[PDB]
Amino acid sequence: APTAPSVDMYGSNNLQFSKIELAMETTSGYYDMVKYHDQAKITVKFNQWSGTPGDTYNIYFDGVKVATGAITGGQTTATFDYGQGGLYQMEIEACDATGCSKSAPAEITIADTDGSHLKPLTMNVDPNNKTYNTDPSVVMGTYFVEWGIYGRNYTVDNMPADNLTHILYGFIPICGPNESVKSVGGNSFNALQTACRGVPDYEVVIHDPWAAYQKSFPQAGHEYSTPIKGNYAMLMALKQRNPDLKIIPSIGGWTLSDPFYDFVNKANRDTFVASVKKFLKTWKFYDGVDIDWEFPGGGGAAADKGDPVNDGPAYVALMRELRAMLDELEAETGRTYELTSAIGVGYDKIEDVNYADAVQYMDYIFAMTYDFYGGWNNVPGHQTALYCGSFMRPGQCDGSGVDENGEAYKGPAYTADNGIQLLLAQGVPANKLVLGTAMYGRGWEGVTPDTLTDPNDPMTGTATGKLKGSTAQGVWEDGVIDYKGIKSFMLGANNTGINGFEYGYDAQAEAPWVWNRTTGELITFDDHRSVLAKGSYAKSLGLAGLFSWEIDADNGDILNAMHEGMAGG
Template identity: 80%
Template sequence: MNRITLCAASITLALSGAVMAAPAAPSIDIYGSNNLQFSKIELAMETTAGYKQMVKYHDQAPINLTFNQWSGETGDTYKIYFDGLEVASGAITGSQTTARFTYEKGGRYQLEIAACDDNSCSTSAPVELVIADTDGSHLTPLSMNVDPNNKSYPLEPNTVVGTYFVEWGIYGRNYTVDNIPAQNLTHILYGFIPICGPNESVKSVGGNSYNALMTACQGVPDYEVVIHDPWAAYQKSFPQAGHQYSSPIKGNYAMLMALKQRYPDLKILPSVGGWTLSDPFYDFTTKANRDTFVASVKRFLQTWKFFDGVDIDWEFPGGGGAASDLGDPIHDGPAYIALMQELRVMLDELEAETGRTYQLTSAIGVGHDKLEDVDYGQATQYMDHLFAMSYDFYGGWNNVLGHQTALYCGSFMRPGQCDGTGIDENGEPYKGPAYTTDNA
């Protein structure tokens, strides 16, 4: 081969090398796309309005990613990888390209973007991308701050140890989710979820409770559930949980989501009703109202996926609650049983859709006058647990001395008071057995 031929071959190889050069590696814009934080739930963080205006859940998180290639060849197409799995692709549009797509599963991902031509690809440096979801999959386990007096102890099999965590406890009590000794618990009941509709009893609380509920229920049909205090539930930042201004979900709900990342077997249930929020239950003798409620609870659980079912705290079927004029001893009991059946059907549907297990529980009054109004033997076939309200047996409201949370009858009782066969201090026959857990 002569020198001219060798020179031509060298030129050909050089030209081929230029053609074969890989595209410039993309540089991911970590400042533009919401700091690479995205969310399946869209929450109003700086306003107060109706629940449906403030909370919008998306089955797919909208993702916008911008990457730059300020020098070199850009290539023709891009590929986007989450933890090495290709999730999107498209055409490169120039030295700066924005990829728009949706993604279903929340979590924390190592994001890489590859720029490709027909011959090769160049990949960006990995960065972390967060997609928030209400199952808390985007969160790290909550750092706990439990009082050292709360010693840990082993839970016996088939034992239920539950507690209420009240939405307003973060204020005057300054008690936050990270203070809960959750290592010793099987259940947390989050109190309380209100039902829109007639709620005169809430006015007895005073303050802004009634007005806040009326605001939450703007644009929401009666007998649907809402969040009473958005600030406490998902707007307030808790620095100890790593909340930032841009965090998509904050408040008690984000803390509870992170708590479940630490204790995945813990069951967290929204408790619907309570002493001052039970008025709408008395309209559940009408099936249409129950249907509205059950469908609303289903949407609530689909939106707030860290919850593991629902707890019903109707105080009380038959009457005797905060609203003295409400209660039907004849019809409330059958309505309660029907409600449990209809909720169980709905939860079974959710289980089939999600592959999860959902629990149905209820807090019930255990005085004889409360128990006689519901056939709990019929209701419990649909339920996982009954939480006996074995407290408030005596108090300032009845001006009778006794143990507030008595397990058994005491020697202070009058003859026949324990079993209800005697005569009270006014000479009237007792209406039933004394309020004790044993009698209940």
């Protein structure tokens, strides 16, 4: 036998390799930062000094031959392609006529974006999140937001994964027209422009690569040499821990929807869809695509856009082409891919798409059954109600009446059930709809008792302006408030009212509120009871399940209520 081969660790990159090179110390165009390879370029050096090195080498991973070549002297550098991620016990075998000598096994790491090379994530979940007899056939979705790792300080390991089947990662931008991104203020529009340099219009990109894959997370064991970090490496590890959990990219949303309005041009769709396939090939932990176009026909962040005539068909065509692309990805990988979309449920949003035509391609519609009322104006109302509250005027629920300035109503009122029914009437199968629960409140200030026309119902009053508060109370933007912030700063431990706030519940609409008679502060939100009503309603209608916006704002209560209201028959 030859001399035993000896592995030069330094000359073998310390046996660490990766299918994806990721810029770690700069912010640039998407393709200056992200380079993917189907075959990792593996390089192993070994030494057989002042001895008999033999004629040929073989390299095994877990006893399986992956590489072979000739030996010439005491220094052999072996290169070769490997296309599957993982950890492997690697062995070097030198052979010649008289037999074969081996190195001692050493662990080689081939990183890939499926997490195949990672140990299951170490969770750090608030224990208020209870343990449940999960039913894997019911949808329990939620949104996790890329920027929530900053001030909100809520990271992938805080997610109650065991109580989720569906994680929607918000949000993936589309390069092109994005004037809406500017009202978000800050660095946001500039971050987009940087990521889209060298990127053709209507291609998807990562908006914040620092959060996505750059930030070193200690609890995830990240270090300087670590080839993938940030949120994505954590989601990858999370798939190893929870393999059946669907993690799906969410494209668009409120401020990143502007480019969807050009998808009336099929060539822009062709470029988009293709970029979505490369995205999913590049980022293998994702399980499909969710389209959050707000909204065909208009009505979203851009007062500027919206085509009620042509947007609907563009969206149907997009779902077909996205479905057909995912079909051929399923053929290439053997995986199953899901296609979903979050939609408005006001009647004026719903009528702009023939969801019967598009649903044939989709797995789930996430019905955004919330933001019915809020601080953009001074009309109190249930923002996330199952049914129409008593504060609504006659013929206002169904849109048959006229408003309090004698003007007529143009469609049914903003409730979840008005929304669902309109979708069922359209032909959408009930077992593809997912009902939305809020994990935040919307609220006003200055709804003093004396603004009320019905003294039992502050939803009957008038506001002076948006709710105000601090970051620490969960108020990240005026007139909006995390549920956990409502819990600990307005509800209290017994849910009976603290710091001047009362509790109330509109049993007819299935909608809670908290109300401060003195400040006139009014908050509408989803609570334990109201989510229970949504569970019952979902079951009664054969709805696929429930989903929530946004997980960082929950404290446990809402997701708990979601499981409990879904339990049983």
